[PDB]
Each structure stands twice: as structure tokens, then as C-alpha cells.
Symmetry: C3
Subunit: 286 residues, 3 copies
Amino acid sequence: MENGYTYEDYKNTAEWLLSHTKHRPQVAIICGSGLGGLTDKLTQAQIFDYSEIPNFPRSTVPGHAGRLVFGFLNGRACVMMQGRFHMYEGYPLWKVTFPVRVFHLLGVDTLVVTNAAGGLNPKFEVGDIMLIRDHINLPGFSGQNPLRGPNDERFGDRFPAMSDAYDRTMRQRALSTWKQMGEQRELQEGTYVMVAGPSFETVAECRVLQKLGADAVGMSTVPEVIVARHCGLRVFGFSLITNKVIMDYESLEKANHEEVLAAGKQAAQKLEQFVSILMASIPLPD
Amino acid sequence: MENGYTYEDYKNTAEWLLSHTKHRPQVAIICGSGLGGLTDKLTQAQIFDYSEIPNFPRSTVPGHAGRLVFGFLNGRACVMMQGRFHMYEGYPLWKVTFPVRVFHLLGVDTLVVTNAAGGLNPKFEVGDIMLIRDHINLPGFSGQNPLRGPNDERFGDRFPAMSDAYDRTMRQRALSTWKQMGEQRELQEGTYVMVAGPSFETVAECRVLQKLGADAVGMSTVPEVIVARHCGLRVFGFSLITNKVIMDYESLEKANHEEVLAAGKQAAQKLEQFVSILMASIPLPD
Amino acid sequence: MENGYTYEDYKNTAEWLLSHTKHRPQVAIICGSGLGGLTDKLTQAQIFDYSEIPNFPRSTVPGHAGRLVFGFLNGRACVMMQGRFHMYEGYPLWKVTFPVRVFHLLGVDTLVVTNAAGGLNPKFEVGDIMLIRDHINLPGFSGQNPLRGPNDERFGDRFPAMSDAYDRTMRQRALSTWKQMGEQRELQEGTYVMVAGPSFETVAECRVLQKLGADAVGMSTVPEVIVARHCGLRVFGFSLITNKVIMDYESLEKANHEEVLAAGKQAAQKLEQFVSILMASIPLPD
Ligand SMILES: O=c1[nH]cnc2c(C[N@@H+]3C[C@@H](CO)[C@H](O)C3)c[nH]c12
Ligand SMILES: O=c1[nH]cnc2c(C[N@@H+]3C[C@@H](CO)[C@H](O)C3)c[nH]c12
Ligand SMILES: O=c1[nH]cnc2c(C[N@@H+]3C[C@@H](CO)[C@H](O)C3)c[nH]c12
């Protein structure tokens, strides 16, 4: 197998965007789940549907793939993805992560990634926000790693390290912002495990993931982080705990998408505020 | 990637079978290992070789794939698969599970799945029968999930839950049937872990699987269950423990297919009886 | 999916080599990392670039793939691979392991495999040599097993056992050779876990692998061993611990390829000596 994209392809997509907007972003934000509305806070906003952009992964109905929104968020020149690609949809990881390498060639230096996740840590509660300190890449252990294939030194090394993936400094700076918001619940912090999905975990599977030392489980993010780190980006991310994974056989409740989207809706304002203030804490370049 | 089968394909296979038999099955039974002989107890039996049926996964020698046998088992209108597809044979999971979606469109409402499995729980003994209370889908954590790809709402939801996969009621009703048979060994119950195989586990691997909380290990079943649950089927299943996985380096014994097939032969009568009586306990439809 | 190679292909590659060298090897050595120099100790050495050999997996620049070197090492007729294929490079496992089946048809009866590995056992130290007593095949649990696909009985069984993969006798005989060398550090022994890579593990991932009972982690070897065992070869192998995997968040150190290659260089002489003496301990055939 190999990444279907040549270096020329990524460059071509970046050149195209560079020619169609005067915006020059520094921060890329992948808006996870129930956080799409964050583009409503950008100023000077210029929207591009993924369907218009050369080389972007395609959805059957071209528009449901989503859009890149360039603008300014609380001082920072941003590009936000509203709509992301998941491997459970059938995309190979070199398509899932194609935009990350584009952001880099646009001059982005920081990637913020967010998602919704199921809570594995028994102390977490629906609505909780968990900052991501580390991840467990289960698909990557098996060969599903976005860097599989010939390496291009123009982006990075053959064997990049991931032990420092999540910027220590901005997890610190985010603990600050949280007190400034004056919040009842404390800001959670922990390990995110990626599983492919799309079906939800069984009880026995949830117990496995808890014993691996994971705090939250979702179906995305890890690959983007790996590709970000590989090309030099600073990374910060968090998960909204939208549900507490079922851990025992007596329970008569089940994980469901409606309940995940509901939690998304509730935590919407909190999240957009949270991310907007944090922009000020991202270092300026140079 | 995507499922090579369109909704039309599944419908076409179901329409074909519906036109070639007057039998209308309610229960699908996937006969696992050393339980093929169960078709000898059907009455009014009509056999179809997989090679004759449109869209069915193909074996090199078309006949070795197996056959669908329609009939009546102790009162219930059944369709049994004698011969199944495994991912270790090279089939993608959307081929492995193609028949499950066909059963559904035939009007089946219940799936019974059986298999042979290696015992991980140290109390299990060769010959033991373990009812399946839950599973650990290791291939699915990595992306090998039969629902990967665009979802079709005609079968089910994008994100189906699996925590309730194994019908509580019929595990209860099966504990009954077992006492009615008056058996020496108790009916075992536990967690089935799927690994792809086809080679057998090492000692270090067996210890891993034991520590994941698995009781039995095999190379099948999970995907069919996921697809069953996804389209609304009730599911019950069990494993014949054909061997006790080697757990220490001193042992000079090794897992082997001859010994697995032997255990299959011994437990043959016990199994066919067990499943036949249980049919009476499957609710009627409506 | 299926193995792209027919039995004829393997036979054709073996016949070709058999026609182009008078050497008839008994022992195959896959030279892992910083152990390529071992070909400098062969006598009567005949080199074949992988690019010249029919059916050999191909590298973009044909020469960077490596070479087969036939010769005599301390008494034994050997064939050594200098350069190997990894799944993180994009090769399917039936390409990674193609040479193993060729060795067999050349008449090889023993496979020695070596590699560099990250230390998970906290007692190991950089420079340590760990003999491999067992392995955990994480990719294989998910379907990435070199035997996936139709089985060819000419090489072996559908379901080969792996619990006895690493020859008990020569791990014993290697403990000997080590004292004969008069070494300060003791010869380590333990479990090798394969992960696909190519990126390095996170802290949370390292803790997972430690709790699986693994002592060393690398990105190769397991598949070759599985295919070796499947066709009847005796197998012995070891890992050079080139680094101690980062296990806590305070550490400011990171795994890196330079440091791995450095450790390789240091342990070079020790390794070539170690393997050369050991040849005398490999049983003669017949
Ligand atoms: O319990 C969970 N298990 C795995 N993933 C999730 C997620 C992340 N979801 C997974 C998927 C279903 O809403 C959507 O792509 C975002 C929330 N809860 C859970
Ligand atoms: O020890 C085991 N490990 C994994 N699978 C099995 C099975 C299930 N088998 C696996 C395979 C070998 O008989 C056949 O497809 C049914 C029995 N014993 C074991
Ligand atoms: O810390 C580690 N994690 C995983 N693999 C390795 C290896 C084996 N390496 C992996 C790769 C990087 O040097 C090369 O193919 C040989 C050494 N150290 C580690």
C-alpha cells in the first residue's frame, strides 16, 4: 500500500487555498462534535466547501463532507474544519489526515483538536471536559497508522516520537482559562484511546479499555495528532464526555447517538467560549 | 474502502431464495464446528449450495463454501448455514457477514451462532459448553468492523450499541434446557474474544487474552453478531470448548486442528440435542 | 484478499538462486539492526542484490532493498538478509515474509532472526541483549497475519501452533556461548511484542505493552517467525535493547532513530561475535 497523495498534491491544494483567500492562518482547529457552531464566532470569515478544494477527501453528497472556514478568533488567524473524516466511514488514514499536511503548508503552526468521547474514568460526568494529556492508538498497533508507506522527509522523519504529543504548556494554560471562566465542575485531564468503531463498545470491551489506563474513548483524533506531530505542529486537544460507557451487565441503558448529540448541544456555549479565550494563550509565531 | 454489496444485491439474493423455496424461516442458525450434522434433524429439508445463490461469497472449489439448509427444527422454521466464512481465509468482513443481512430480508428474527473455542478460563474443560454473555472484538478496535464504510439506514443506525448483544432472556432459557437434559458438567457462561488467526496463540498471547477478561478465544462469530444486532436480530450463541489454551512454558502440548475436530465429534450428539430443544424456547414472532 | 504469490513463484525464485550459486545454505539469518556488518565475517561470500532476484519485494530505488549474501559462517552454510521489509513501509505481510518461504525451498532448516528493540522491562539497559522466548503478535490479533488467505499444504497446515515457536534447545545453548564470551552484563530473556509503527510509542502505550507482559517492543520479526514455523523451520532470535522506552510524563527524553542507530554501532562487534560462535551450536542436518 501507499499514500495516494504525492507531495505535489498537498502543495497544489495549499497553493490553491493560498490563492483564494487573503487569510493566512496560524492556528488550525478541528471542530469535533457539537462544536461546529464555533465558526459563528470567527470574524472576517471566508468559507470553502471541501467539495471545491482540490484533492480533499470526497463525501458521496459532496457538501456533507463539510467546509474549511478561515477567519480571526479572539486575535488569532485561524482555519477551522467543520466536518471531519473517520476511518469507520471507509477512508484510509492518509485521506483522514490529508488536511493536516495542508494546514502545515499554509503556514499553520498549531493544531487544536476536539471531539466527543465516552467516559471510561468512573469519576467523569456527562458534560465534563477532558483535556488530552496522552493517547493510546489501538488501530496504529495493528498497522493503521497514517504514516504507513514511504516517508517524505519534506514533512518529517521516518520514526517520529509521540511521547510528547500534547503540548505541556497549553494544558497548563488551559487549566488557567478554566478558572477564569469560573466553572463548577473541574477541568478533567487524561488519556484518550482511539478505537475505529463505528459500533459502540460492549461491557467487556469497556473494561478492557479502562484497564489499559484510558479515561476517554472515541473514534478519531489520534491520526491527525500523529500527522501534526510528524510535520512539527504544536498540538492541544480535549474531549467532551458525552456519556459514561456502560460498565456492568445489570444496567439497562445503552450508548446512543441521540444522547451524544444532546450532550453536544448542552455544552455548546461552554465550549465555544472555552476555545475562544484560549486562542489568546497560544504563542504568537516567531 | 466500501462494502462491495449494494442494498439491491442483498435484496436480489433474498428475492431469489424466496422464489426457490416455500420455506419461510424465522430462526437462522450458523452451525459452528462439529455441529454441521444438525441439518440431519431438520424436517422438510431443502438444501441450496452457496455456489448456486446469487451474490454469496465464493470458495475456490465452489462446493467447499457450504450450503444453506431450510427446514423445521423442533417446531421452528429455520435456515441453517453449514460452512461459514472467516477473515483468516482472506474474505473482507462485508463478505463474511453478507448472509446475515440476507437472513433478515428473508424475515428471520433470531440468529443462533455457534462455534468451537479455546478455553481461557482455567476452570473450563474440553467438552464444556460456554454460553456467550459478551464478546471482545479485537479486530474491530483496529478498523476490522463489518459496518465500516457508508451506512445504509435500511438495515440500521450509523452507531449501533453492542452492550446488549446477547439476549439476556435466552441465556436464561438455555440454563433451563441444560438441567432438562440432566447433564453432569454445568453449563458454562462467559466472554468470547475474537482474534483473526489462523495460527494459534502463543503462551504470552494466551495470558494477554486471559487478562483482558476473556473466557474463550476463537476466530469467528463477532462480526455476524455485530451485523445481526445492527439490523435488529435477537442473538444467542455458544462455544464448545475444544481445548484448553496452553498457558505455561513447561507444557509439551500444543493446540492442533485434529484435537479440535475430535472434541467436535464427541460433543456432536449433545450439541444437536441441546440446540433442537432450545428452538421451543425461542419466542414465536408477533 | 490473497497472497499475491503462487507456489510456482516461490519455487521459481528458489530454482533461480539454486542456479546462480553453488552455495547450499542450511541456516538463514535475518540481520536486524546494526548487525548488517555480520556479512563481513562470511567466507566464500556471494552477494545477490534483492533487485536481481525474481519475485523479491521491490524498493523504489531497487538497491536500498538490500541483498542476500550466501557463504560460510563458523562452519555453517548460511544465507543472510542484509535489509528487511517492514509493514510500516507499506508492504503486505505476504511480501514481508516472501524470503522465508524461499529459504525453506533452498533447503534452509533454521532461521535466526535479530532486531533492535525498545526496552519495556525496567531492568533492561541500553546495550543489553534479550533472547526471545516468546512474542505477542498484536497486528495478527486484528487480521494482519502473514498466513491470511488460502493455505498451501505444500508449506504447512491451515492452523499452525505458535506456543513452541522459539527453539528451547538453542536458547539454552545461547546462554552457554554468552559465558564463554565472558560478559559483564547477563544475557536477558523475555517476550517480544510486535507493533506496526513507524512512529514511537506514547507513555500510555508503553504502559499498556508493559502490562501485556512484554519485555521488548519492535516493528518486525513476528511475521517471519510465523511463516518459518509454518513451513517447519527451527527458529532462534534476539533483540538488542537500544533504548529504554519512556514510561513517565516528567522525563524530557524521547525515543529517536539516531540513538537507536548509535546503540546499534556500539553493540556491533559483540553481536557478530555472539552469532558467529553460536553457529557451531546449531545442529547439523540429518
Ligand atoms: O461511548 C463512546 N464510545 C466510542 N466513541 C464515543 C464518542 C465519539 N463519537 C463516536 C461517534 C458516535 O457519536 C461520533 O463519531 C462521535 C462518544 N461517545 C463514545
Ligand atoms: O485455541 C484456540 N484458539 C483460537 N481459536 C480456537 C478455536 C476455533 N477454531 C479455530 C480454527 C481452528 O480449529 C477453526 O476455524 C475453529 C478452537 N480452539 C482455538
Ligand atoms: O522504542 C522502540 N519502539 C518500537 N520499536 C523500536 C525499535 C526497533 N526499531 C524500530 C525502527 C526505529 O529504529 C527500526 O525499524 C528498528 C527500537 N526501539 C524501539
